[PDB]
Design an enzyme around this catalytic site. Structure first.
Site, PDB file in Angstrom:
ATOM      1  N   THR A  14       1.033   2.768  -8.293  1.00 27.23           N
ATOM      2  CA  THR A  14       0.443   4.024  -8.728  1.00 27.23           C
ATOM      3  C   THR A  14       1.518   4.824  -9.465  1.00 27.23           C
ATOM      4  O   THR A  14       1.232   5.499 -10.454  1.00 27.23           O
ATOM      5  CB  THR A  14      -0.109   4.790  -7.524  1.00 27.23           C
ATOM      6  OG1 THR A  14      -1.061   3.953  -6.854  1.00 27.23           O
ATOM      7  CG2 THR A  14      -0.805   6.070  -7.966  1.00 27.23           C
ATOM      8  N   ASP A  50       8.039  -3.524 -10.826  1.00 27.94           N
ATOM      9  CA  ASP A  50       7.147  -3.328  -9.698  1.00 27.94           C
ATOM     10  C   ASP A  50       6.842  -4.682  -9.068  1.00 27.94           C
ATOM     11  O   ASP A  50       6.594  -5.660  -9.769  1.00 27.94           O
ATOM     12  CB  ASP A  50       5.876  -2.650 -10.227  1.00 27.94           C
ATOM     13  CG  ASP A  50       4.867  -2.341  -9.148  1.00 27.94           C
ATOM     14  OD1 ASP A  50       5.261  -2.078  -7.995  1.00 27.94           O
ATOM     15  OD2 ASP A  50       3.662  -2.336  -9.476  1.00 27.94           O
ATOM     16  N   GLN A 104       3.342  -6.701   0.238  1.00 26.71           N
ATOM     17  CA  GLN A 104       2.735  -7.430   1.347  1.00 26.71           C
ATOM     18  C   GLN A 104       3.740  -8.498   1.778  1.00 26.71           C
ATOM     19  O   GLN A 104       4.531  -8.973   0.963  1.00 26.71           O
ATOM     20  CB  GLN A 104       1.406  -8.069   0.923  1.00 26.71           C
ATOM     21  CG  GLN A 104       1.486  -9.048  -0.238  1.00 26.71           C
ATOM     22  CD  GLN A 104       0.135  -9.651  -0.581  1.00 26.71           C
ATOM     23  OE1 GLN A 104      -0.453 -10.382   0.222  1.00 26.71           O
ATOM     24  NE2 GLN A 104      -0.370  -9.343  -1.772  1.00 26.71           N
ATOM     25  N   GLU A 157       0.787  -1.234   0.000  1.00 28.61           N
ATOM     26  CA  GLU A 157       0.000   0.000   0.000  1.00 28.61           C
ATOM     27  C   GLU A 157       0.821   1.287   0.000  1.00 28.61           C
ATOM     28  O   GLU A 157       0.266   2.369   0.205  1.00 28.61           O
ATOM     29  CB  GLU A 157      -0.954   0.036   1.204  1.00 28.61           C
ATOM     30  CG  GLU A 157      -1.817  -1.207   1.401  1.00 28.61           C
ATOM     31  CD  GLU A 157      -2.622  -1.589   0.167  1.00 28.61           C
ATOM     32  OE1 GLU A 157      -3.115  -0.691  -0.544  1.00 28.61           O
ATOM     33  OE2 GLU A 157      -2.778  -2.803  -0.083  1.00 28.61           O
ATOM     34  N   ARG A 197      -7.195   0.191  -6.526  1.00 27.82           N
ATOM     35  CA  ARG A 197      -6.343  -0.579  -5.643  1.00 27.82           C
ATOM     36  C   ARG A 197      -6.440  -2.067  -5.899  1.00 27.82           C
ATOM     37  O   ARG A 197      -7.511  -2.667  -5.781  1.00 27.82           O
ATOM     38  CB  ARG A 197      -6.695  -0.332  -4.184  1.00 27.82           C
ATOM     39  CG  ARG A 197      -5.925  -1.267  -3.256  1.00 27.82           C
ATOM     40  CD  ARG A 197      -6.366  -1.152  -1.820  1.00 27.82           C
ATOM     41  NE  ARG A 197      -5.630  -2.073  -0.953  1.00 27.82           N
ATOM     42  CZ  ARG A 197      -5.968  -3.339  -0.731  1.00 27.82           C
ATOM     43  NH1 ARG A 197      -7.041  -3.862  -1.309  1.00 27.82           N
ATOM     44  NH2 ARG A 197      -5.234  -4.082   0.085  1.00 27.82           N
TER      45      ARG A 197
END
Ligand SMILES: Nc1nc2c(ncn2[C@@H]2O[C@H](COP(=O)(O)OP(=O)(O)NP(=O)(O)O)[C@@H](O)[C@H]2O)c(=O)[nH]1
Ligand SMILES: [Mg+2]
Length: 316
Positions: free
Chosen positions: A17, A169, A173, A12, A147
């Protein structure tokens, strides 16, 4: 003329993004067909957000402001299945709108640090009339706000300043960190992302671990890894927009007990920057290039990335 960029950071933090911004800034954005592919993601994110708030109301024992919302909540689940398939009826939109406007739902929304809620919940729920419109087509911002945690490794290519960028990328997590090492070869620069607004939150993987503390541990590991001595370390202190709003109402001492500054952006942001930069064990021989960002803000990312590219060209 080839540059390999690797995006790292906890879940997150905004890595994916930033990836989307490269397409918008250097590849002329998402086409109509591409935007339509995100329609079901926008709807799913929206439905999941209101459902998460409703679920939290049960856990925290928060009643609806108006009893009539009980029936809307019932209808929400009856109609929710459509969203995931890319369909948003006027009826479902009405149900979600009334729930979102309820004072009990809002009371719960404002206590989101107590449970897990997508950062783009308000963004979509406050734009229900637009996204529920017939023939709705996600905007570039709508796409940036989606998301979907990353699993595996994503590779994107683009040209900028006569350089061929290869951006990698990966998921942040805990279950995905074991895969970071697959991307460790030939890295020109690492862009390590940190969610500034994570200071008063806990990991979805473990509610006993402060999110920012987790991020610090990861940065400590990466920045000081001898393997990356000749790799430029770029630090993106992201979600500065959410941080600016949060620092006004949530004490930074929750994360850093020793913080003696005020509940204002400048002092708090500088303090966090210092906490991360202090993790560098070789301050005289290893430089960290820090930038404060709002990954969903194209103009901010454009100027920051321009600055980052200059450092990469001059150093590598
Ligand atoms: N307001 C705001 N939202 C942001 C910002 N950066 C990312 N977001 C939002 O935060 C959410 C998570 O972003 P994302 O890029 O998926 O994070 P990630 O680090 O890739 N996650 P993972 O490691 O799980 O793959 C998205 O809904 C995104 O739009 C920011 O600066 N401000
Ligand atoms: Mg991601």
């Amino acid at each position: 003329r080839e540059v390999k960029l690797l995006l790292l950071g906890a879940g997150e933090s905004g890595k994916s993004t930033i990836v989307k911004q490269m397409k918008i800034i250097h590849e002329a954005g998402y086409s109509e067909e591409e935007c339509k592919q995100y329609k079901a993601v926008v709807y799913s994110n929206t439905i999941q957000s209101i459902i998460a708030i409703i679920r939290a109301m049960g856990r925290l024992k928060i009643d609806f402001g108006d009893a009539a919302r009980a029936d809307d909540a019932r209808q929400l689940f009856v109609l929710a299945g459509a969203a995931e398939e890319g369909f948003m009826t006027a009826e479902l939109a009405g149900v979600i709108k009334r729930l979102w406007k309820d004072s009990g739902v809002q009371a719960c929304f404002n206590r989101s640090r107590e449970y897990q809620l997508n950062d783009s919940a308000a963004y979509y729920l406050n734009d229900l009339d637009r996204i529920a419109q017939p023939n709705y087509i996600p905007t570039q911002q709508d796409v940036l706000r989606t998301r979907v945690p990353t699993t595996g490794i994503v590779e994107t290519h683009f040209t900028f300043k006569d350089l061929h960028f290869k951006m990698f990328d990966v998921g942040g997590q805990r279950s995905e960190r074991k895969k970071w090492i697959h991307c460790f070869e030939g890295v020109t620069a690492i862009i390590f992302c940190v969610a500034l607004s994570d200071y008063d939150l806990v990991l979805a993987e473990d509610e006993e671990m402060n999110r920012m503390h987790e991020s610090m541990k990861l940065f400590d590991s990466i920045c000081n890894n001898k393997w990356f001595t000749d790799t430029s370390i770029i630090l993106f202190l992201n979600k500065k927009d959410l941080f600016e709003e949060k620092i006004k109402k949530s004490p930074l001492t929750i994360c850093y007990p020793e913080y003696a500054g005020s509940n204002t952006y400048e002092e708090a942001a500088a303090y966090i920057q210092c906490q991360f930069e202090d993790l560098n064990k070789r301050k005289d021989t290893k430089e960290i290039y820090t930038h404060f960002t709002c990954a969903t803000d194209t103009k901010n990312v454009q100027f920051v990335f321009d600055a980052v590219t200059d450092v990469i060209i001059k150093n590598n």
